[PDB]
Design a protein around this ligand. Structure first.
Ligand SMILES: CC[C@H]1/C=C/C=C/C[C@@H](C)[C@H](O)[C@H](C)C(=O)[C@@H](C)[C@H](O)[C@@H](C)C(=O)[C@@H](C)[C@H](O)[C@@H](C)/C=C/C(=O)O[C@@H]2[C@H](C)[C@H](CC1)O[C@]1(CC[C@H](C)[C@H](C[C@@H](C)O)O1)[C@H]2C
Ligand SMILES: CC[C@H]1/C=C/C=C/C[C@@H](C)[C@H](O)[C@H](C)C(=O)[C@@H](C)[C@H](O)[C@@H](C)C(=O)[C@@H](C)[C@H](O)[C@@H](C)/C=C/C(=O)O[C@@H]2[C@H](C)[C@H](CC1)O[C@]1(CC[C@H](C)[C@H](C[C@@H](C)O)O1)[C@H]2C
Ligand SMILES: CC[C@H]1/C=C/C=C/C[C@@H](C)[C@H](O)[C@H](C)C(=O)[C@@H](C)[C@H](O)[C@@H](C)C(=O)[C@@H](C)[C@H](O)[C@@H](C)/C=C/C(=O)O[C@@H]2[C@H](C)[C@H](CC1)O[C@]1(CC[C@H](C)[C@H](C[C@@H](C)O)O1)[C@H]2C
Ligand SMILES: CC[C@H]1/C=C/C=C/C[C@@H](C)[C@H](O)[C@H](C)C(=O)[C@@H](C)[C@H](O)[C@@H](C)C(=O)[C@@H](C)[C@H](O)[C@@H](C)/C=C/C(=O)O[C@@H]2[C@H](C)[C@H](CC1)O[C@]1(CC[C@H](C)[C@H](C[C@@H](C)O)O1)[C@H]2C
Ligand SMILES: CC[C@H]1/C=C/C=C/C[C@@H](C)[C@H](O)[C@H](C)C(=O)[C@@H](C)[C@H](O)[C@@H](C)C(=O)[C@@H](C)[C@H](O)[C@@H](C)/C=C/C(=O)O[C@@H]2[C@H](C)[C@H](CC1)O[C@]1(CC[C@H](C)[C@H](C[C@@H](C)O)O1)[C@H]2C
Ligand SMILES: CC[C@H]1/C=C/C=C/C[C@@H](C)[C@H](O)[C@H](C)C(=O)[C@@H](C)[C@H](O)[C@@H](C)C(=O)[C@@H](C)[C@H](O)[C@@H](C)/C=C/C(=O)O[C@@H]2[C@H](C)[C@H](CC1)O[C@]1(CC[C@H](C)[C@H](C[C@@H](C)O)O1)[C@H]2C
Ligand SMILES: CC[C@H]1/C=C/C=C/C[C@@H](C)[C@H](O)[C@H](C)C(=O)[C@@H](C)[C@H](O)[C@@H](C)C(=O)[C@@H](C)[C@H](O)[C@@H](C)/C=C/C(=O)O[C@@H]2[C@H](C)[C@H](CC1)O[C@]1(CC[C@H](C)[C@H](C[C@@H](C)O)O1)[C@H]2C
Ligand SMILES: CC[C@H]1/C=C/C=C/C[C@@H](C)[C@H](O)[C@H](C)C(=O)[C@@H](C)[C@H](O)[C@@H](C)C(=O)[C@@H](C)[C@H](O)[C@@H](C)/C=C/C(=O)O[C@@H]2[C@H](C)[C@H](CC1)O[C@]1(CC[C@H](C)[C@H](C[C@@H](C)O)O1)[C@H]2C
Lengths: 75, 75, 74, 74, 74, 74, 74, 74, 75, 75
C-alpha cells in the first residue's frame, strides 16, 4: 500500500498541470472582451455575456483536472 | 496488484494533462466570436452557431482525455 | 507480468497528452472561420467546408493518440 | 512511510507547474487593457473593471494549483 | 524481459506526444487558407493546393511519431 | 530518509519550472506598454502604472513557485 | 544488458517529441506563404522559393530528432 | 548519500527548464521595441529604457531558476 | 555500468527535445521574410541576409542540443 | 558512483531543454527586425543594433542551460 499511496500523491500533483490551460484560456477570453469593447464601445452589452460563457467553458476543463486531483487526494 | 494500482493512479493524473488543450482552445474560439461580433455586430447570428460548434469539437478532445482518466481510475 | 501491465497503464495515460494539439488546432480553425466570415460574410459557403476539412484532419492526429492509448489499455 | 513522504514532496513540486498559466494569463489580460486604453483612452473606466475580473479569474487557477501543493506539504 | 517489454509500452506512449505538433500545424495552415480566401476570394484556386501541400508536410511529422510508436508496440 | 531527502531536491528543481510563466508574462506586459506608447505617446502616464501592476501580479506567480522550492530545499 | 535495452526503447520514444517543432514550423511557413500570396498575388514566384527553403530547414530539425531515434532503435 | 547526490544532479538539470521563459520573454520585449520604433522613430528615447527594464525583470525569473540549479549543484 | 549506459541513452533522447525550438524559430524567421517581402517587394535584397543570420542563430541552439545528444551517445 | 554518474548524464540531457527558449526567442527578435525594416526601410540602422542586443540577451539564457549541462557532463 506504500506504493499506491505514493502514487495517489504524485498523481494528484500531476493532475493540476492542466489548470495552466484554464489560466491561459480565461485570460484569452477577457483579452478579446477588452479589445472588442475598446474598438467598439456600443457592443459591450452584447459581448460581455459571451465572455462569461467562454470563461465558464474554458474554466470547466480546469474543474475536471482539479476533480481528478481531489479524487486521488481523498477519494 | 500494488504496482498495477499505483500505475493506474499515476496514469490517471497524466491523462488529465491533455485537457489544457481544450482549455486554451475553447478560449481561442470565444475570443474570435467576441472579436468578430465587435467588428461586425450584424454577423452575430451567423458566427455564434459556429462558435458553439468549434467549442464543442475542441471540448470533445478533452473529453477523450478524461475518458482514459476515468477508465484508469475505476475501470 | 505486473511490471509490464503497470507500464501499459502509465503508457496509456501518456498517450493522451498529444490530444492537446487537436484541442488547440480545432479551435484555431474555427477562430479563422469566425474572423473570415465576420470580415466577409459573402464568403461563408466557400470557407465553411474548408473549416470542416481542416478540423477533421487536425482532430485525426489526436485520434491516433487515443488509438495508441486504447491499444495500451486493452 | 518514507516512500509516501517522498511522494508528497515530489507531488508538491509538480503542483506548482500549472502556475505558469496564471503568470502568462495575468499578463495577457494586462496587455489587452494597455493596448485597449492606448487605442481608445476614453474606454479606460469601462475596460478596467473587466481586466480586474479577468486577471482575478485567471489567477484563481494558480491558487488551485498552490492549494493542492500546500495540501501535500502540510 | 519484463523491463524490456515495459520499456516498449512506455516508449510507445511517449512517442505519440509529438503528434500535437501536426494537430496544431495542420490547423495553422487551414486557418491561413480560410483567412486568405476571406480577404481575397479570387486567390482560392492558387492557395488551396498550397494548403494541401502544407498540411501534407506537417502531417508527415506526425506520421513519423506514429511509426516509431508502432515499431515499439510490435 | 535518503529517499525523503532525494525527493526534496528533485521536488525543488521541478518547482522552478513554473517560473517560465512569469518570464513570459512579464515580457508580454512590457511589450504592450512599448507598443501602446509607440502608437499613442500621450497615454504613457496612464498605461505605465498599469504595466507596473501587471508585471507585479505576473511576477507573484513566480514568487510562489520559488517559495515552494525554498520550502523543499530547507 | 536488459536495462540498457529498456533505456534505448524509452530514449527512442523521447527522441520523437522534438518533431512537434517541425510539425508546427512547417505550418508557420506555409501560413505566411498563403497569407503573403493572398495579400499580393504578384509576389508568388518570389516568395515560393523562400517557403521551400524555410520549410526544408524547419523540417531538418525533426530529421535530426528521428536520426537519434533510429540510432537508439537499431 | 549516493541517492541524495544523484537527486541533486537530476534536480539541477530540471531547474534550468524555466530559463526557456526568459529566453522567450526577453525576445518578446525586443520585438516590441523594434516594431514600436519602426512605426514611430521619434519615440525611441522613451521606449528604450522601458525595454531594458522589461528585459531585466524577465531575465531575473530565469536567474532564480539558475540560482536553485547552483544551490543543487554546489 | 548498466545503469550509466542506460542513462546515456535516455539522456541522449531527452537532449533532442530542445530541437523543437529551432524547428519553430527557423519557421518564424522565414514567415517574417515572406510577409515582409509580400508587403514590400523592393526590400527583398535587404531582408534576405537578415533572415539567413536569424535562421543561423536560432539553428545554433539546436546544434548545441544535438551536440550534447551525440556526446551522450558516443562521447 | 554508478548511480551518481547516471544522474549526471540524465541531468545533462534535461539541462538542454531550456535551449528551446533561446531558439524561439532569437527567431522572434529577427522576425520583428525583418517586419520593421519591411514597413520602414529607413529605420534599418536604428533597429539592427537593437536586434543584435535582443538576440544576444535571449541567447545568453540558453548559454546558462548549456553551462549547467557541461558542469554536469565533465565537472
Ligand atoms: C462549471 C464551470 C464554472 C462555472 C461558471 C459559471 C459562470 C457563470 C458566471 C455568471 C459566474 O458564476 C461568475 C462570472 C462568477 O464566476 C462568479 C461566481 C465569481 O464570484 C466572480 C465574479 C468573481 O468575482 C471571482 C473573481 C471570485 O472573486 C473569485 C474568489 C473566484 C474565482 C474562481 O475561480 O471561482 C471559481 C469559479 C467561479 C468556478 C466556475 C465554475 O467555480 C468554482 C466553485 C466550484 C469548483 C471548486 C470550481 C473549480 C474550478 C477549477 O472550475 O471553482 C469557484 C471556486
Ligand atoms: C460533445 C462534447 C460537448 C458537447 C457540447 C454540446 C454543445 C451544444 C451546446 C448547445 C451546449 O450543450 C450548451 C452551450 C451548453 O454547453 C450547455 C449544456 C451549458 O449548460 C451552457 C448553456 C452553460 O450554461 C454552461 C457554460 C454553464 O454555465 C456551466 C456551469 C457549464 C460548464 C461546463 O463545463 O459544462 C460542460 C460542457 C457543456 C461539456 C460539453 C460537451 O459537457 C459537460 C457535461 C458532460 C460531461 C461531464 C462533459 C465532460 C467533457 C470533458 O466532455 O462536460 C459539462 C460539464
Ligand atoms: C531538408 C529535409 C527535407 C527535405 C525537403 C525538400 C524540399 C524540397 C521540396 C521540393 C519537396 O521535396 C516537395 C515539396 C515535396 O516534398 C515533394 C517531394 C512531395 O511529393 C510533396 C509535394 C508531397 O506531395 C508530399 C506531401 C507527399 O505526398 C507525402 C507522401 C510525403 C510527405 C512528407 O512529408 O514526406 C517527407 C518530406 C518530403 C521530408 C522533408 C525532408 O523528406 C522525406 C523524404 C526523404 C527522406 C526519406 C526523409 C526522412 C524521413 C524518414 O523523415 O523524409 C519525406 C518522407
Ligand atoms: C504525410 C502523408 C499524408 C498525406 C497527405 C495527402 C494529401 C493529399 C490530399 C488530397 C488528401 O488525400 C485529402 C485531403 C484527404 O486527406 C482525403 C484522403 C480525406 O478523405 C479527407 C477529404 C477527409 O475527409 C478526411 C478528413 C477523412 O474524413 C478522415 C476520416 C480522415 C482523417 C485523417 O486524418 O486521415 C489521415 C490523413 C489523410 C493522412 C495523410 C498522410 O493519411 C492517413 C492514412 C495513412 C497514415 C495511417 C496516416 C497517419 C497520420 C498521422 O500521418 O493517416 C489518414 C488516416
Ligand atoms: C481571485 C484570487 C486573486 C484575487 C484577486 C483580487 C483582485 C482585486 C484587485 C483589486 C487586487 O486585489 C489588486 C490589484 C491588488 O492585487 C492589490 C491588493 C495589490 O496591492 C497590488 C496593487 C499590488 O501592488 C501588488 C502587486 C503587491 O504590491 C504585491 C506584493 C503582491 C502581488 C500579488 O500577486 O499578490 C497576490 C495576489 C493579489 C493574489 C490574487 C488572488 O492574492 C494574494 C493575496 C490573498 C491570498 C494571500 C492569495 C494566496 C497566495 C498565497 O497565492 O494571494 C496575493 C499574495
Ligand atoms: C510579487 C511582488 C513583486 C513586486 C513588484 C513590485 C513592483 C513595484 C515596482 C515599482 C518595482 O519596485 C520596481 C520596478 C523594481 O522592480 C525595482 C525594485 C527594481 O530595482 C528595478 C527598477 C530594476 O532595475 C530591476 C530590473 C533590478 O535591476 C534587478 C537587479 C532586479 C530584478 C528582479 O527581478 O528583482 C526582483 C523583483 C523586483 C521582484 C518583484 C516582486 O522582487 C524580488 C525580491 C523579492 C523576491 C526574492 C522576488 C522573487 C521573484 C521571483 O518574485 O524577487 C526582486 C529580486
Ligand atoms: C552553426 C549554426 C548553423 C550555421 C548556419 C550558417 C548559415 C549561413 C547560410 C549561408 C547557410 O550556410 C545556408 C542558408 C545553408 O544552410 C546551406 C548550407 C544549406 O545547404 C541550405 C541552403 C539548404 O538548402 C538546406 C535546406 C539543405 O538542403 C538541407 C539538406 C540541410 C538542412 C540542414 O538543416 O542542414 C544543417 C544546417 C545548414 C546547419 C546550420 C548550422 O549545419 C548542419 C551541419 C553541421 C551540424 C551537423 C548542424 C547541426 C544543426 C542541429 O545545427 O547541421 C547542417 C546538417
Ligand atoms: C553573450 C552571449 C552571446 C554573445 C553575443 C554577442 C553578440 C554581439 C554580436 C556582434 C555577435 O557576436 C555577432 C553577430 C555574431 O554572432 C558573430 C560572432 C557570428 O560569427 C555571426 C556574424 C555569424 O556569422 C554567425 C551567425 C555564424 O554564421 C554562425 C556559424 C554562428 C552560429 C552560432 O551559433 O554562433 C554562436 C553565437 C554567436 C553565440 C552568441 C553568444 O556565441 C557562440 C560562441 C561561444 C559559445 C560556444 C556560445 C554558446 C551559447 C549557448 O552561449 O555560442 C556561437 C557558437
Amino acid at each position: 500500500m506504500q506504493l499506491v499511496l505514493a502514487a495517489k500523491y504524485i498523481g494528484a500533483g500531476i493532475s493540476t498541470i492542466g489548470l495552466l490551460g484554464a489560466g491561459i484560456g480565461i485570460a484569452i477570453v477577457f483579452a478579446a472582451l477588452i479589445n472588442g469593447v475598446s474598438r467598439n464601445p456600443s457592443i459591450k452589452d452584447t459581448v460581455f455575456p459571451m465572455a462569461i460563457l467562454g470563461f465558464a467553458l474554458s474554466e470547466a476543463t480546469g474543474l475536471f483536472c482539479l476533480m481528478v486531483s481531489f479524487l486521488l487526494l481523498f477519494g
